[PDB]
Amino acid sequence: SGFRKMAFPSGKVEGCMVQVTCGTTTLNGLWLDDVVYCPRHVICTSEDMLNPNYEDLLIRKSNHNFLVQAGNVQLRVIGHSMQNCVLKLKVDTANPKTPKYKFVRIQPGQTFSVLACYNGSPSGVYQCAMRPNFTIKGSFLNGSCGSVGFNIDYDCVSFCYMHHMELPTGVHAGTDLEGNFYGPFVDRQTAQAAGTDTTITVNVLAWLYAAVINGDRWFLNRFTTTLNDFNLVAMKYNYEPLTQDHVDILGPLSAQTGIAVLDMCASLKELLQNGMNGRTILGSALLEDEFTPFDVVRQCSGVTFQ
Amino acid sequence: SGFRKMAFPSGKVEGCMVQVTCGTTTLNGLWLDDVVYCPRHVICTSEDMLNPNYEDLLIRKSNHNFLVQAGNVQLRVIGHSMQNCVLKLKVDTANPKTPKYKFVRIQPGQTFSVLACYNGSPSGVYQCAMRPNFTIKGSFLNGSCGSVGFNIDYDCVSFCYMHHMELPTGVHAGTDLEGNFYGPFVDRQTAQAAGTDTTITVNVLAWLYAAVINGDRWFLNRFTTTLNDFNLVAMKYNYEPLTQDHVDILGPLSAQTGIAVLDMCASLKELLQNGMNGRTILGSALLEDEFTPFDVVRQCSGVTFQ
Numbered sequence: 001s002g003f004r005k006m007a008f009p010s011g012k013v014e015g016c017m018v019q020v021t022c023g024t025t026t027l028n029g030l031w032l033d034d035v036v037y038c039p040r041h042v043i044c045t046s047e048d049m050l051n052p053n054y055e056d057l058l059i060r061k062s063n064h065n066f067l068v069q070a071g072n073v074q075l076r077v078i079g080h081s082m083q084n085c086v087l088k089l090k091v092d093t094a095n096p097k098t099p100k101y102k103f104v105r106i107q108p109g110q111t112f113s114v115l116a117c118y119n120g121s122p123s124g125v126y127q128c129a130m131r132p133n134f135t136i137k138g139s140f141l142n143g144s145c146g147s148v149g150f151n152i153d154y155d156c157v158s159f160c161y162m163h164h165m166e167l168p169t170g171v172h173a174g175t176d177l178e179g180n181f182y183g184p185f186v187d188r189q190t191a192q193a194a195g196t197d198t199t200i201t202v203n204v205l206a207w208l209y210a211a212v213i214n215g216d217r218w219f220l221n222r223f224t225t226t227l228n229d230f231n232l233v234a235m236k237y238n239y240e241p242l243t244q245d246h247v248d249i250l251g252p253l254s255a256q257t258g259i260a261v262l263d264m265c266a267s268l269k270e271l272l273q274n275g276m277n278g279r280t281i282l283g284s285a286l287l288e289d290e291f292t293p294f295d296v297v298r299q300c301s302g303v304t305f306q
Numbered sequence: 307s308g309f310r311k312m313a314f315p316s317g318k319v320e321g322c323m324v325q326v327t328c329g330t331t332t333l334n335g336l337w338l339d340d341v342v343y344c345p346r347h348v349i350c351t352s353e354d355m356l357n358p359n360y361e362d363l364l365i366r367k368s369n370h371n372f373l374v375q376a377g378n379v380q381l382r383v384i385g386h387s388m389q390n391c392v393l394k395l396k397v398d399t400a401n402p403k404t405p406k407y408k409f410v411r412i413q414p415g416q417t418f419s420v421l422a423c424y425n426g427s428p429s430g431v432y433q434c435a436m437r438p439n440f441t442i443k444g445s446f447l448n449g450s451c452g453s454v455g456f457n458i459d460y461d462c463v464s465f466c467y468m469h470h471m472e473l474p475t476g477v478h479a480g481t482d483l484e485g486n487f488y489g490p491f492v493d494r495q496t497a498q499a500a501g502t503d504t505t506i507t508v509n510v511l512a513w514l515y516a517a518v519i520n521g522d523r524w525f526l527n528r529f530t531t532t533l534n535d536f537n538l539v540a541m542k543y544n545y546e547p548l549t550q551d552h553v554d555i556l557g558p559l560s561a562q563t564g565i566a567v568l569d570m571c572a573s574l575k576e577l578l579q580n581g582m583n584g585r586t587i588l589g590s591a592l593l594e595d596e597f598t599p600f601d602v603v604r605q606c607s608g609v610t611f612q
């Protein structure tokens with residue numbers, strides 16, 4: 001038993017992490033087969049960072065301008081191209097540690113592991129959710145750009161996130177691995193801001209099921225509610241609407257615990273209207289919304305990855 | 307910016323994880339050079355698990371009884387010996403992925419990363435603290451024994467924990483890598499229990515400094531307090547006494563933020579006496595005590611590992 005914010009083992013990604021330096025900018029790149037992926041703003045310098053034109057900036061670059069460092073081995077760049085907001089640096093060497101992988105784009109509400117890197121070297125790993133407003137509450141300092149977010153699905157790494165920037169509230173924005181930003185953000189210094197977030201309702205319910213599985217039961221009740229009546233409460237407390245599909249996805253957890261999904265909604269309602277009254281749930285005094293139903297099933301049943 | 311419960315990159319440990327099967331028991335082993343380390347209770351079966359005599363049980367074993375599986379390669383056991391509560395299985399092959407390592411024993415209050423494994427395959431990674439009562443609040447299911455806890459110090463893995471068991475409150479107990487239990491626990495089914503815990507005071511203060519570094523300032527005050535007067539409050543709220551050495555260790559964080567350690571203590575006092583009044587600190591509605599001063603400095607300055 002126990003329930004922890006658990007990241008995927010990072011080894012497969014660690015072997016793909018490289019250093020990319022161009023001009024005065026050093027960031028991280030992702031080396032898969034003979035391509036290194038990195039944020040395109042590496043080709044910028046200070047004055048370039050207000051209103052850049054990256055097509056103009058890229059045509060002025062040379063392969064030899066890109067210093068790519070895989071540990072203590074320099075990788076010769078032999079081609080480069082821009083794909084949206086990522087740069088694809090073709091290098092003369094395929095990464096022998098390339099795992100099976102996919103580039104996937106995730107939905108707000110879904111979670112992933114971030115391997116925070118500096119200078120191509122992994123610093124730490126942690127779990128994140130894509131917020132409804134397409135930001136992530138990460139932990140990122142200067143030089144962390146190009147760190148990736150990912151899931152692992154048996155032996156296959158699904159890369160979903162590459163880090164580009166921090167917003168004024170201290171949250172983080174980036175792209176999928178095809179270079180397309182999550183949310184309405186651009187890789188420029190503008191006055192852009194996150195915009196209002198909501199709590200991921202289905203995830204909160206998943207975490208309540210994790211709590212029941214782990215022996216926290218105090219918030220349970222005999223009450224029930226309709227899906228419509230629950231969503232009128234969710235709206236007031238700035239929770240995402242719960243769909244019938246969310247109810248279906250919570251089925252297995254409902255079955256294991258014997259608590260109907262709509263019954264757990266009634267519990268959530270009471271927690272929203274009354275608070276926790278000094279109690280905790282799974283060591284939290286807040287309703288936690290960064291575990292998906294899958295995350296709960298994964299942890300509470302012991303799925304591994306080969 | 308941002309602050310996350312961050313684990314170390316797990317790759318170096320992942321390459322050491324193997325499966326050990328003996329009889330009806332399958333657990334994880336740690337393969338370093340030509341030795342596999344695993345919990346000695348692998349040599350037990352159901353009836354063996356009440357009041358065992360492991361010296362008796364081990365002399366009845368044969369090298370060939372130990373099925374050691376490194377991925378899809380079976381490792382031939384050529385010797386075995388007991389060291390306290392761990393078994394050392396000598397195998398005919400040195401692990402080519404053996405990192406530089408040390409066996410270290412940690413102090414309550416210190417943190418480490420756990421690579422949760424099943425069947426020798428990594429499932430997830432998360433950060434833990436050694437509680438003052440020598441338990442850890444982990445996430446462990448049947449088959450997770452032999453998973454290790456560790457820190458990474460540049461390129462060197464300091465293994466500090468191997469998992470053996472869960473206690474009736476859902477917390478976890480285990481040994482250092484020399485087989486010596488953390489705390490007054492034994493690898494038997496007895497009525498043993500954790501025993502009363504305390505909150506790791508120096509860590510809470512570290513996390514308050516992390517909050518200030520990250521722009522959470524609402525809990526700060528002009529007040530100060532003496533170390534003695536703070537500790538009279540700490541005792542009432544079941545917090546560990548703060549020592550002058552703790553104050554010294556918090557020096558660098560005090561210097562970076564400009565908040566005297568004893569001033570931050572005064573803030574903690576007020577949080578203890580008054581609660582948080584609906585506010586959060588670093589996304590928590592609880593005072594968090596599983597970040598050490600080192601963890602905070604590490605994350606808020608970007609230390610990596612090569």
Ligand SMILES: *[C@H](O)[C@H](C[C@@H]1CCNC1=O)NC(=O)[C@@H]1[C@H]2CCC[C@H]2CN1C(=O)COc1ccc(Cl)c(Cl)c1
Pocket residue numbers: 027041049140141142143144145146164165166167172186187188189307
């Ligand atoms: C890339 O390493 C870096 C990552 C940032 C730095 C601080 N936290 C992060 O996650 N990205 C940036 O510096 C990007 C840069 C590329 C696109 C736009 C431009 C500006 N920017 C920002 O992240 C701006 O916010 C910001 C906040 C705090 C700090 Cl210290 C900095 Cl350097 C930037």
Ligand SMILES: *[C@H](O)[C@H](C[C@@H]1CCNC1=O)NC(=O)[C@@H]1[C@H]2CCC[C@H]2CN1C(=O)COc1ccc(Cl)c(Cl)c1
Pocket residue numbers: 001333347355446447448449450451452470471472473478492493494495
């Ligand atoms: C080893 O894989 C296993 C890990 C346990 C299992 C559940 N959570 C864990 O962390 N260890 C044990 O099963 C040990 C075993 C070796 C020493 C004593 C004996 C009993 N025990 C326990 O952990 C007893 O507690 C316990 C609680 C809940 C469950 Cl499902 C189980 Cl199997 C054991």
